[PDB]
Design a protein around this ligand. Structure first.
Ligand SMILES: [Ca+2]
Length: 240
């Protein structure tokens, strides 16, 4: 997250860190949303590599013991059957990860609240991005969970030529584009939390930024639209 502020420990308890096994170490690669005690929602592209993955819940500082973490292996990965590595701009950037164990819920570990199917927000809807991603374009990861106020940019505007044009589909959410705050590498697969009827719900799964840079004016961060996928999500979980 470029232009973030440090999150409070208990603000976003559905955020996980998706990590891969790197020599003898575990490195952060993506964010995710805990949507059941045994199911994580992330981006497809974050599990295109055949790595050994683990999920960390209750995580605040990547490099310290917070006293709150639970570290859980991934037992099954279900990517959207339409996902194509070679075409992010097509969409379907979403995956469900089944956890080897159920986690325990507490004030650091909760489930993310999903939108009703078909829900579109109005332009300029108040949402936050959260993540341990790069804090500058070509920068480094954050140690602590960053948050950024990232208001939505409607389809009509986002698809217009000055903005993303044709690259963005109506199965996506655009948020931000001010030149100052954005998603950046390592935020991918995480949440976009938006305030609807007094409740934060997870509307977006972070998917891409511009090739020219993370924080680029009139290139909002682009998210998979979760509300486009509710029947898919539900069908996966009922049947595994
Ligand atoms: Ca920690």
């Amino acid at each position: 997250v470029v232009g973030g502020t440090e999150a409070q420990r208990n603000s976003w308890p559905s955020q996980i860190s998706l990590q891969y096994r790197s020599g003898s170490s575990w490195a952060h690669t993506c964010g995710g949303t805990l949507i059941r005690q045994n199911w994580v929602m992330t981006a497809a592209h974050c599990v295109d590599r055949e790595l050994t993955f683990r999920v960390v819940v209750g995580e605040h500082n990547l490099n310290q013991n917070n006293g709150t973490e639970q570290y859980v292996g991934v037992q099954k990965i279900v990517v959207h059957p339409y996902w194509n590595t070679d075409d992010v701009a097509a969409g379907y950037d979403i995956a469900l990860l089944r956890l080897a164990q159920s986690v325990t819920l507490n004030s650091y570990v909760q489930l993310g609240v999903l939108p009703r199917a078909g829900t579109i927000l109005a332009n300029n809807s108040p949402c936050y991005i959260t993540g341990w991603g790069l804090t500058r374009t070509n920068g480094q990861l954050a140690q602590t969970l960053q948050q950024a106020y990232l208001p939505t940019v409607d389809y009509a505007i986002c698809s217009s030529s000055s903005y993303w044009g044709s690259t963005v589909k109506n199965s996506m959410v655009c948020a931000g584009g001010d030149g100052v705050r954005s998603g950046c590498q390592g935020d991918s697969g995480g949440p976009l939390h938006c305030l609807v009827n007094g409740q934060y719900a997870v509307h977006g799964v972070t998917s891409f930024v511009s090739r020219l840079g993370c924080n680029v004016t009139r290139k909002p961060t682009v998210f998979t639209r979760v509300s486009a996928y509710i029947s898919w999500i539900n069908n996966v979980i009922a049947s595994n």
